[PDB]
Structures are given as C-alpha cells and as structure tokens.
Design a protein around this ligand. Structure first.
Ligand code: A1A7X
Length: 599
C-alpha cells in the first residue's frame, strides 16, 4: 500500500540525507586514501595502473575503486583528483545505504502484502550513527565502494530469493540470474575479503541450479571478469595477491590481538547493546533441496553468516591500525537483514497482540535512541597500534578537514620533501632524519658527463623517498619521483620481506633503510650516507639483491611490458608470490647463498 511504500521511501531518504550530511561534515582522506589516488594519477598520465613510473606494484586492493576513481578523475576537468575521491566515496556509500535499505524492504515486503505496516530504520541507522562508518564514508578507501557493493548484492540476493514464483519453470529471470552471478563474481575483485561473500553467494546460486550445464554456465558467466583481471594481475604484477596483502607473511592465529581490537572498537560506542537489541528485535519480528536455498530465510542466513565470517577473518588477521575500517564491512553485513524493521500488526485486534507495537516500536526507540548517542559519543582510537586515523591526520596537519592533497602538505615531513627535491637537482634518496624533521639526503650517483647536456628540459636525477606515510607523498612529491614504503605498501622489496616477531599490527615489518639505499643510483660510501645507517648492512643488502631469485622477481615487476612478459608473469606468478626474503641482510646473503662482502 502507499501508506507503507511512502514510509519506506521516507526512511530511505532520511537515512541517506543524514548519512550524506555526516560524510560531508567530515571531509577526510587517509594516507592510504591517497595511495589510490597516486595509482590512478599514474594511470591517467599514460603510465598504466601503477604506483610509480616503472615500479609495477599493485598498492590498490580494490581493483574497482581504483578504476572508479580513475574514471572520475578522467571525466573531471579540475586538476584535483581528491575531489573526485570525495564525491565518489560520498555518492557510492549513500547509494550502498539506499540499496541495502531497499533490499531489506523487499525482504520484508511479502509479509506486509495483506497487512499495512510502517517500516522504520534500525540496524542500518545505528550503522550510520557509528562514528567510524561516518568517518570512513568519505576517504579514498573502499568503504564507500564496499558499502555500495554490499547494498547492491543484498538487494539482488533478496530479489532472487523472492523471485521463486515459477514464471516458466526457471523460478527466476535468466538475465537477472546472470547479472547477480556477475555481481557475486565481482565481489572477489572489489575486496579480497569480500570473496568470502562472493564465494558463498555463488554456491547458494549454484546449488539452486538444476543441471550441471546450468551450474557451469552460471559459474563461467558470473566469474569471467574476475578471472580475466586475475590473469591481468598475474601479468602486469606477477603476483597472485594485490601486493599489500603480501606484505604480511604467515599472518594468522592472532586471536588475542584480534579480540583486543574488537574490544577497542566496541568500547567507545558500546556495540553490545545494539547487537543484543537488534538480535532480539529481529527475532521478535520473525515470530510472525534447491528450493530451500533460494528462500528469503536462506538469504538472511547468507548475510548473517557472511558478516560473521568476515568478522572472524578480520580477527584472525588482526585489525589494522585503522580504528574500525576492517570491522565496518562485517558489521554492515550483520546489520543488513535488520536494516529496516516493519511494525506489522499480528492481525489475528483485542490489544494482547497489539502489545507487539508496545514491544516492537519501543525496541526501535531503544535502537534509534542509542544511535543518537552513538554518533555524538567521541570515538577513541594503551600500547596497542589502534589509532583513529582521521583524528591523527587532522591533528597532525594544519587542518581539521584534510580533504585535498594540498592540505596534507602541512604534515611535518611533507613540506621538507618538496623543499629538498627542488633544492637538489641531481637526484637524492630522502630518508626521515633522526636529528630533525627534515630529510637526510643520500645524494644520487652523479649524472655522467654529456648525459646532463643530453637531457630535455635540464637534467633531474632519480628522487626516491623512503617514508612510512605513502599516499601523501604520492600526491605531493610529484609523478616522476619514486615513492616507497618501509612496510611494503608499494615497495616490492619490502613486501617480500619475511617477519620474525608478531610485534605491532600494520607497522611491525619496518624494512631497514639499508635495503632502501641498496637499490637505485645511490651512493654507498660512509661520508655521504647518513650517519645513523650501518654501512655493512648496506653492502650486504646490495650483494643480496643480486641473487638470481630476488633479481628475477624484481625484473618481472619492473622490466618493459610485452606479450612475452605478460605470459611469463602469468606462468610464474605462483613462484613469485611464494618467495620470502629474510629481513636481516646478513641472513639473506646466507639464505640466497652469495658470499658476504668485506667491510
Ligand atoms: C579471500 C579472503 C576472504 C581472504 C584473503 C584475501 C586477502 C588478500 C585479504 C585482505 C587483504 C588486505 C589485508 C587488504 C588491506 O587493504 P588496505 O590496507 O586497506 O590497503 C591500503 O588501503 C588502500 C585502500 O584499501 C590501499 O591503497 C592501501 F594498500
């Protein structure tokens, strides 16, 4: 009836407007949020989907947000791509919320066919309130595209579940089924963890197909683009994984650390009350072969199990330094099936059954009310590596809303990098100076005579910056200046580095600067390198990089691309992925088998 359709529309409009206003009132783009940006700039300048010119390191786990922002930046005439990232994050996240609302509305629709009820926003409303969700709806991270994808997939899965009406014996439109399969396949691309959902989404559809031929067709059509881009990834990167995810070696069974992260995430907002209350409310509302998998209860179980598995995977992998970025997706999955709750009357009219309202609207008030307390409650990010990155970068730079990459220049070491680069025109390896905030320069190898004069527009050497914060360098340093990270976000040598101790999460595997100065035309002798580096480590690392395996891995990720290079990378992606380099230069030279040079 209109009395319920309009109520659903008003709930969707209200939540979308509130969430969009909350996003626009916190314009934040993380340092990682500028990594996507860096890559897409390299793509729009003709250098392909790469982080640095020649260094084919895939620092974007999204594979769709990267290209979505690429398209946005292409169409945009304003030189700032940060505005593209902001607009796309807002729009995609708002669309995700709207789509999940409408999917839940369709899920509850069959129950309200003969009974008129007022939908109300719950579960998803608290998600809007939850400050991490509001903060991360704006950054250049995937939490906008992830929300959009989850909303779309939820709506399509609900449509498929209710689609079981036997129009011509197929129980669902062929085109709609194929498109849903395609979306489920794209889950793998959108975010590697989402593959779980994308897996569990496909199987539920596969088991719903009668004949093996139909299952084969569904799995092929649904997973054609993801497999094609996996082949392209193998080729243009030589890695089975994006490259960041490879920066973690033997990372598992961090149950204690993951539990600590979950408790930290729950503490400033008290998510236990929403969880308990929404579980009780969903149960109270619920108290009204292939056929049993293609049912709305099956899809609800799908979304709940997908959220639980996402949370379990995140705990097993350990929540990153982000306050709540990792847990937003599983939490959104949990809240999706109860994203909009109908106040249907039992319609057995004596009052005893009417108590439902007094015990189901009231619960929603105890939900929405908590939401009004959840947003307003400050979100704290004491030895744990969990820090609210939005607050960190707002109080680290000179601005409270660090939207543009020109705003990030106020960061302590990010004006100094530019001053040094224009100060030294013969190249340099820039490292964070221990004495002062400015950069220690290991000057690049002096350019050879007659090559300085044989250069277009004056000779500029190879500038290589080595610093933990990566994206802000990408969008402030310049397109042609190599950008590298200690952890291995965009450093091919660091990503392969093996780890000895668990340490901290997201920042433990700090590669030695000796490795960083090992590669590139950078001077080695003690007088020119900074004092606080060890020359012996530098020489040992340089001797280590010449080993056949590491040298071959680097060549396959830096040599000029071609058909032969693409085929060889596809063939040897497995070999390159399962190749770990010991952190200590001396122990590597022992492992690789090359002799240790004398001091
Ligand atoms: C199949 C399943 C379910 C399990 C394995 C699948 C898998 C590979 C696991 C997850 C990989 C992982 C840790 C990704 C972390 O991404 P993140 O730290 O956000 O990336 C940085 O943030 C920016 C935008 O994301 C990027 O520019 C930066 F790189």
């Amino acid at each position: 009836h209109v009395w319920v359709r309009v109520s659903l529309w008003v709930s969707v409009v209200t939540v979308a407007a509130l969430f969009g206003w909350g996003a626009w009132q916190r314009r934040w783009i993380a340092d990682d949020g500028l990594i996507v940006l860096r890559t897409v700039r390299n793509l729009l300048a003709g250098n392909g989907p790469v982080f640095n010119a020649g260094e084919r390191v895939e620092a974007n786990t999204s594979t769709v947000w990267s290209y979505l922002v690429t398209l946005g930046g292409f169409v945009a005439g304003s030189a700032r791509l940060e505005y593209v990232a902001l607009v796309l994050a807002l729009t995609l996240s708002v669309l995700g919320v709207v789509l999940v609302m409408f999917g839940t509305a369709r899920l509850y629709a069959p129950g309200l066919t003969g009974r008129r009820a007022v939908f109300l926003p719950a579960g998803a409303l608290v998600y809007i309130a939850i400050p991490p969700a509001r903060d991360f709806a704006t950054s250049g991270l995937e939490n906008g595209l992830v929300l959009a994808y989850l909303g779309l997939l939820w709506w399509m899965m609900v449509c498929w579940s209710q689609g079981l009406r036997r129009p011509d014996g197929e129980r669902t439109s062929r085109g709609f089924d194929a498109t849903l399969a395609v979306v489920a396949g794209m889950s793998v691309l959108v975010r590697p963890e989402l593959a779980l959902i994308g897996g569990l989404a496909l199987v539920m559809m596969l088991v719903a197909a009668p004949t093996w031929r139909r299952r084969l067709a569904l799995v092929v059509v649904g997973g054609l683009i993801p497999v094609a881009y996996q082949i392209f990834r193998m080729g243009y990167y030589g890695l089975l994984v994006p490259g960041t995810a490879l920066a973690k070696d033997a990372s598992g069974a961090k149950w204690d650390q993951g539990l600590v992260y979950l408790a930290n995430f729950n503490q400033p907002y008290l998510l236990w009350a929403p969880a308990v209350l929404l579980i009780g409310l969903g149960l109270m509302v619920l108290l009204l072969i292939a056929r049993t998998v293609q049912s709305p209860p099956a899809v609800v179980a799908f979304m709940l199990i997908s959220g639980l598995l996402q949370a379990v995977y995140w705990i097993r992998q350990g929540g990153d330094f982000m306050h709540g970025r990792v847990l937003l997706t599983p939490l959104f999955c949990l809240l999706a099936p109860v994203a909009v709750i109908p106040l249907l009357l039992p319609d057995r009219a004596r009052g005893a059954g009417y108590l439902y309202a007094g015990a189901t609207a009231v619960l929603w008030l105890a939900v929405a009310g908590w939401a009004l307390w959840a947003a307003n409650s400050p979100g704290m990010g004491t030895y744990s590596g969990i820090v609210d990155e939005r607050r960190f970068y707002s109080q680290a730079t000179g601005h409270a809303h660090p939207l543009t990459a020109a705003d990030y220049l106020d960061y302590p070491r990010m004006r100094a990098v530019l001053t040094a680069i224009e100060n030294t025109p013969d190249g340099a390896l820039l490292l964070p100076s221990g004495d002062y905030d400015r950069w220690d320069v290991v000057p690049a190898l002096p350019p050879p005579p007659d090559v300085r004069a044989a250069a277009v527009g004056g000779y500029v050497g190879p500038h290589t910056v080595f610093f933990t914060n990566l994206g802000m360098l990408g969008m402030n340093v310049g397109l042609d200046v190599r950008v590298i990270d200690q952890i291995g976000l965009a450093n091919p040598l660091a990503a392969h580095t093996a780890r000895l101790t668990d340490g901290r999460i997201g920042h433990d595997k700090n590669l030695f600067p000796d490795w960083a100065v090992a590669e590139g035309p950078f001077l080695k002798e003690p007088p020119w390198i900074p004092q606080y580096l060890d020359e012996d480590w530098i020489r040992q690392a340089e001797a280590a990089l010449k080993c056949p395996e590491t040298d071959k891995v680097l060549d396959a990720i830096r040599a000029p691309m071609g058909f032969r290079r693409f085929l060889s990378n596809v063939m040897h992606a497995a070999e390159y992925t399962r190749y770990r380099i010991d952190r200590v230069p001396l122990y590597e030279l022992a492992r690789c088998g090359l002799p240790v040079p004398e001091p």
